[PDB]
Amino acid sequence: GMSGDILNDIVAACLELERKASSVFKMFAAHAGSDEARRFWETVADETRHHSAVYERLQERGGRENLPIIIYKPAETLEELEMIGKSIDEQVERYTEAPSSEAACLLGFRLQLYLLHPAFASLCRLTRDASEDLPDIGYGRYLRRFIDGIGSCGLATAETELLGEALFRLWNEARQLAAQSHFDALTGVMTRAGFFKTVGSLAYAAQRSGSNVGIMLIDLDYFKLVGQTGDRILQLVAETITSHLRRSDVVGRYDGDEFVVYLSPVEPASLRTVAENLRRSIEEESARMVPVTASIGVAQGILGTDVDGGIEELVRLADECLMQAKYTGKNKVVVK
């Protein structure tokens, strides 16, 4: 399947990108003017290569058992990671044309930015999620070593090795913390909080342009016995919803079984169609697992100066539409 290929290619891309970053650092180490700098770059190289083993383990494991790869908007994520590779290669070529410590510094920082891409941590958390939390990096223990070295002699190189290690690990922790805060583990859509943080910023831009925006709330009903497979339904539906999204639209977890989508720009003329086609897709693409009934409530509007108040209002309106669609559901898609 093209979708499976994509997920496999994202795992491969993350693996290649950390390897490539490691390679570039090794090149900086070989070009370094001092032992201090050489060992800094070698340590960062080593830490980055060691870290990349996570993706290797995902590939190995994924060849022994069916291992769900959970990624926010796979197609767009793969294109971003390929383009990151392309930019790195261009910058490495610029470096090769005129190597210097200064060029290495700037490209090192660019790598530090680029490899913050959410995909990396979205994959790293797969096994941690499996069985439990993030390890203590010990900022404080690193600090104490630097403090105890104040006034030392002969330890410039041991310190830059420590700096390289502390920095890789705290930077990596930052990736993992961002992922835990912004993205849902189970489905890969945004967390509720991440969704509203992302939408806040988009909404301010919407307000400035006078764009129509929308909030859509999607509730799933699947057969239940009275009083695991809900989880699996959620993953599949998240994929269906995600396939209906443009680059400008955002999906998140709203309520526990419930999804929220931010639509921008909205053409009011075509909103009923988009919502109805999502409902049909959700239900038809779920046949081969367990039948699911989707109820969808959607509200749209143009935001005033109180942007937060506006988004709040649309959520409130969408929710009353959702209540109708669920319970007074003559239609299971209610638009306003």
Next chain:
Amino acid sequence: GMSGDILNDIVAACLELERKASSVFKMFAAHAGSDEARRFWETVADETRHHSAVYERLQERGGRENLPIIIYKPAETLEELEMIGKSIDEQVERYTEAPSSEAACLLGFRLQLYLLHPAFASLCRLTRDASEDLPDIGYGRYLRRFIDGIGSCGLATAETELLGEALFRLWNEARQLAAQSHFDALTGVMTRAGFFKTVGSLAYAAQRSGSNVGIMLIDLDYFKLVGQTGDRILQLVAETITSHLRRSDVVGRYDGDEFVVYLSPVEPASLRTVAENLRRSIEEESARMVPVTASIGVAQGILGTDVDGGIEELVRLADECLMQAKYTGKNKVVVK
């Protein structure tokens, strides 16, 4: 008061440290070999200086109204920040003795590590906590600009300015996310999760040395009417508990009104004394606010190979001691 002075000196120290970092970056900009590098360092300088205004605003505001400054272990935090200053000054002196792009790179990275100290975000969150969440930095929007620049000409400098800005803001986000994950907003002690992540690592070291460790659970009872000031009691008690801690001991929020302390090393002979003296301190230091009754349960032991299981067990034992101290509280301090 010495304690108030300390908090004020921590605010001053954070302000000075970001200013100093900004200063060092401006110096790198003046020494830069290329326009590309000059503008990178100037942008990082500017972003860091702009950010430091947060601490200025805390000082201004704190001179107009009583503004609680909430810091984990103030005395130790101040010493760490002073030592960070001292190390920076030593490294700047080493740089001054032999300036180069390579020396600047390494010192830039050292600043990036050092200024991750928890104190910075513990102060930044004071006003955000006041009224609501972290702003979207837009990693994705920065990325799209870099991707759209692939193959460009004449934009090397605009890109390094963008890189400097993206990096400061995402690094700053990392500080704020770490704080939200690891430290309690109200009291400044560790979050429950942060406490166990920190304790996990300490416990592994304890197990290797065969050290006795302890878990103490502290429950507060203060006068209530049937069915705000609880918050204020919590802050004061957190300060009392914190004044009884050695450098090796950790305090966190456990249950909502309840504190957890990790003690290491424990001398079983002196555990009843430490717990009883904490109870007395808590109750006596709370006279001038609202009388508080403290119940304390504490368990101690030597950890086996299953370190997580060991810490779990001590928490379980401490909790049964706490239940006695509260309810079968012939003694309000129960030790095992």
